[PDB]
Structures are given as structure tokens and as C-alpha cells.
Amino acid sequence: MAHSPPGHHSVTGRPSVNGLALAEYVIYRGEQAYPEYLITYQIMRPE
Amino acid sequence: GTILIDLSPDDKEFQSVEEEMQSTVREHRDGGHAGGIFNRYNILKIQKVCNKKLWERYTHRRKEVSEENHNHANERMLFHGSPFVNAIIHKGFDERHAYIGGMFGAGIYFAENSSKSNQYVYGIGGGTGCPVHKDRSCYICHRQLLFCRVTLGKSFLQFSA
Ligand SMILES: CN(CCO)c1ccc([C@H]2NC(=O)c3ccccc3N2)cc1
Numbered sequence: 753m754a755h756s757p758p759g760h761h762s763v764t765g766r767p768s769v770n771g772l773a774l775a776e777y778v779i780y781r782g783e784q785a786y787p788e789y790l791i792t793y794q795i796m797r798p799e
Numbered sequence: 800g801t802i803l804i805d806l807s808p809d810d811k812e813f814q815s816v817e818e819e820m821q822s823t824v825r826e827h828r829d830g831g832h833a834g835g836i837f838n839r840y841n842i843l844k845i846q847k848v849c850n851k852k853l854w855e856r857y858t859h860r861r862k863e864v865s866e867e868n869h870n871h872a873n874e875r876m877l878f879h880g881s882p883f884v885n886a887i888i889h890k891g892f893d894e895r896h897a898y899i900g901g902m903f904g905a906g907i908y909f910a911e912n913s914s915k916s917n918q919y920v921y922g923i924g925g926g927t928g929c930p931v932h933k934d935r936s937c938y939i940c941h942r943q944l945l946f947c948r949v950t951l952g953k954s955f956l957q958f959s960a
Pocket residue numbers: 776777878879880881882883895896897898899900901908909910915916917919923
């Protein structure tokens with residue numbers, strides 16, 4: 753696993769092309785996330 | 800140490816988690832190649848993940864980050880899709896759960912869009928799809944995502960395509 757940029761605790765990937773995309777994020781320490789909810793699902797075929 | 804508690808569909812907590820899942824679906828530039836073609840999900844179950852040791856590990860680190868960032872953890876609720884979901888809920892996140900080849904280096908990746916995390920349920924790029932039918936757009940097989948509490952602290956802003 754890499755390190756965060758010096759003086760930072762994560763990276764934010766801001767979309768700069770696709771105006772509808774939301775952000776993505778990276779952490780470099782597993783301790784910085786807790787898996788709160790487990791969601792079981794299917795994708796639905798469009799009508 | 801992990802127990803899973805089923806949420807009732809009548810529970811406000813079930814409903815707010817489902818709404819975040821459904822409302823953050825988008826179209827993907829791959830036309831559905833990795834994650835499948837869909838506009839919404841059929842939610843089958845939502846379970847609370849309870850592990851006191853993993854929670855204390857999280858809050859210990861959160862306090863360290865907060866103290867380095869004017870008492871601000873910058874905590875978000877974000878999606879994570881992975882073939883190792885069932886390992887993560889028992890053992891926690893660690894270097895085995897990192898995306899070595901990601902755009903922002905080898906780290907653990909999370910998404911605001913549930914449909915982005917859905918692209919990784921069967922591996923990078925959807926791998927070979929569901930184990931049963933080898934279909935990245937399988938409408939039959941049950942998938943799992945995590946909705947995770949994530950400490951960002953001071954976050955480096957990368958503008959990117
Ligand atoms: C454990 N691995 C295999 C990487 O070597 C893995 C796991 C999850 C992800 C994945 N999981 C995500 O939910 C995600 C969200 C936004 C952007 C990228 C994401 N990547 C990628 C790789």
C-alpha cells in the first residue's frame with residue numbers, strides 16, 4: 753500500500769470530464785474505514 | 800467477533816441506506832461492460848456489521864486524524880465493492896483490500912456512486928462476471944456492497960478524467 757501525499761490523510765478523485773460522476777476517494781490505512789452496512793442486492797434489467 | 804444484524808425494511812435506517820444506494824446510480828462510460836446495464840437495484844437485505852474490535856480500531860485512528868486536522872475527521876459514508884467483502888466484514892480493511900493499479904496509487908478505494916462500486920463486486924473491470932453464469936450483467940445472482948464509514952481527514956484534491 754502507498755502512502756497518502758505528505759500532510760494529507762486521503763486522496764479525492766474529482767471528476768473533470770464527466771459532469772454527472774460523483775467523487776471517488778482513496779485511503780492508505782485500513783484503519784480509516786469501518787464496514788458499517790452489508791447490502792445484498794440484484795441489479796434490475798431496465799424495462 | 801463479527802455479528803450481522805438484519806434491518807427491517809420498515810426501519811428508517813434501512814430506508815435511508817437504500818435511498819443512498821438507489822439515488823447514486825449513474826450511467827458509466829463503459830456502457831455497462833464492467834457492472835452491468837441497470838438504472839436501479841432490487842435490495843434483498845441490509846445488515847448492520849457489528850464488531851467491537853474493528854470499531855475501536857476505526858475510532859482510534861479517527862481521533863488521531865481529527866487531532867491532526869483541527870478536530871475534524873472529515874468522515875463520509877461511501878460505497879465499497881470487492882470480491883473480498885466477506886473477508887472485510889470479519890477482519891477489517893487492510894493492504895490485501897487495496898487496488899494496486901488504481902488511478903491514485905495503491906490504496907483502498909471508495910465511491911459516492913453506488914454503481915461505481917458495483918463495477919468491482921466481481922473484480923477489477925467486473926472480472927469475468929458472476930461465478931455461476933460468467934455474466935458481468937447478471938440479473939439473477941446476488942451481489943453485495945459495503946456502505947462504509949470513512950475518515951478522509953485532510954484530503955489531497957486530484958482533478959482527473
Ligand atoms: C482488492 N482489489 C483488487 C485490487 O488489487 C480491489 C478491491 C476493490 C476495488 C474497488 N472498489 C470500489 O468500490 C471502488 C470505488 C471507486 C473506485 C475504485 C474502486 N475500486 C478495486 C480493487
